[PDB]
Amino acid sequence: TTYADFIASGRTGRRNAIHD
Amino acid sequence: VKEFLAKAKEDFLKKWENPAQNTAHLDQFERIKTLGTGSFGRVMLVKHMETGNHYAMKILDKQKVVKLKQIEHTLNEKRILQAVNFPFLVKLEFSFKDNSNLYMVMEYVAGGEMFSHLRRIGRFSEPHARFYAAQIVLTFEYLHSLDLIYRDLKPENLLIDQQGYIQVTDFGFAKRVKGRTWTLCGTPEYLAPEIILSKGYNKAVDWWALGVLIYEMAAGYPPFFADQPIQIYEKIVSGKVRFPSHFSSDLKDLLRNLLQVDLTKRFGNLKDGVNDIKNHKWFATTDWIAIYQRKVEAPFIPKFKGPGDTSNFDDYEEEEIRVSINEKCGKEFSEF
Ligand SMILES: CNCCNS(=O)(=O)c1cccc2cnccc12
């Protein structure tokens, strides 16, 4: 399921903003 | 509303032109615990010794801000924050600087990030998500009306207050601009196609980000996600979105209009402006005035045990505060 794919993904924690 | 905002613009313009400066000293507060961290500083729960009040003090290291080229954005954040006033925006109480850092003392929002609750809980029900979305709708309407673009909407930047309502924090990319802008800003998952395509943009990016928010709240995950940003950028410009099987029809269609790659077809950027959103079927039960007044039934109240309680926040290593013998970036931050 997509949810499972998201949970196993590397971007489930707090996302930082992109500067340069 | 038009009438309300008109008055609102007047107040904002007064402060915009005459921003306040150095309204406190570091030694008036008692440093207690880091509530969140960043690139050039951290936010600390602090206590105003004279009043006994608690606040969240954002501390920016001047050298890191310069090293990262964020001077103008930093000047924007403070200038804008001290001039705005709306029920769903954090209040900047004080600001000052010293030899080494820049400080922004804001109202402490005890409820924690929307992010942490969404993660723990999984997903929010449509009604719950709509409660939150409506607040962001009224906020963008207020912000855009003042020629401002937020540019960093995401769960991490939305704080829940004692009343279950939203408090938008982090105005580090906020900019008052009449016309287009070009900076590559934001968080990958929430970036609009125009931004990733380097074409110059406006307010419509704030409306795309809203679509991303509503979707993440309702499904539990973002509409475009991968393990590296480039894979994400790819998906966003692809113009293809798959909706969870539980999304209501009104939601799939409100979202199809918000996540419109073609910003000449994107809700919020059309002929009727924000009305195309407020008048959407998904929001038919929403009483906008009621929500603005905070007289609505908040679906969830994070509960905190007494003032200064920081249990809704994650623990961070305490980096200690240092201040140089020598002034560090005087001219760059003279207007701060
Ligand atoms: C990273 N998203 C910011 C959320 N938390 S924070 O510590 O940076 C933060 C920033 C600004 C105001 C706050 C008020 N109360 C608590 C935390 C506050």
> Which of B69, B152, B242 is facing A17, going by the closest CB pair?
B152
DSSP state of B178: S
B218 touches B129 (CB < 8 A): yes
Active site includes B152?
A: yes
Q: Per DSSP, what are the bridge partners of residue B97?
A: B102
In angstroms, the Cα distances linking B256 to B86, B116, B282 are 29, 27, 12
Radius of gyration over every alpha carbon of chain A, rounded to an integer in angstroms: 11
Test B187 with A16 for CB contact under 8 angstroms.
yes
Distance B232 CA to ligand 1 centre (A): 26
> Which of A10, A15, A20 is facing B154, going by the closest CB pair?
A15
Amino acid identity of B219? Answer: A
Q: Per DSSP, what are the bridge partners of residue B79?
A: none
- Resolution of this entry, Å: 2.2
Q: What is the Cα–Cα distance from B268 to B202, expressed in whole angstroms?
A: 11
Domain B19-112+304-334, CATH among 3.30.70.120, 3.30.200.20, 3.40.1550.20, 3.40.47.10: 3.30.200.20
Q: What is the Cα–Cα distance from A20 to B158, expressed in whole angstroms?
A: 24
CATH superfamily of B1-18+113-303: Transferase(Phosphotransferase) domain 1 (1.10.510.10)
Q: Per DSSP, what are the bridge partners of residue B61?
A: B101
For chain B, the domains span 1-18+113-303, 19-112+304-334
Distance B49 CA to ligand 1 centre (A): 21
Q: What is the Cα–Cα distance from B176 to B213, expressed in whole angstroms?
A: 22
Q: Which residues line ligand 1 (CB under 6 A)?
A: B 35-36, 43, 56, 58, 90, 106, 108-109, 113, 156-157, 159, 169-170
Amino acid identity of B55? Answer: Y
Phi, psi of B212 (to 5 degrees): -60, -40
Which method was used? X-ray
DSSP E strands, chain B = 29-37, 41-48, 53-61, 92-97, 101-107, 148-149, 158-160, 166-168, 175-176
**Which residue shows structure tokens 């931050």?**
B333
Test B186 with A16 for CB contact under 8 angstroms.
no
Helix (H/G/I), strand (E/B), else coil: A8: coil
Helix (H/G/I), strand (E/B), else coil: B45: strand
In angstroms, the Cα distances linking B328 to B26, B184, B271, B323, B333 are 17, 28, 49, 10, 10
In angstroms, the Cα distances linking B320 to B11, B31, B32, B316, B323 are 38, 10, 11, 12, 10
Amino acid identity of B114? Answer: M
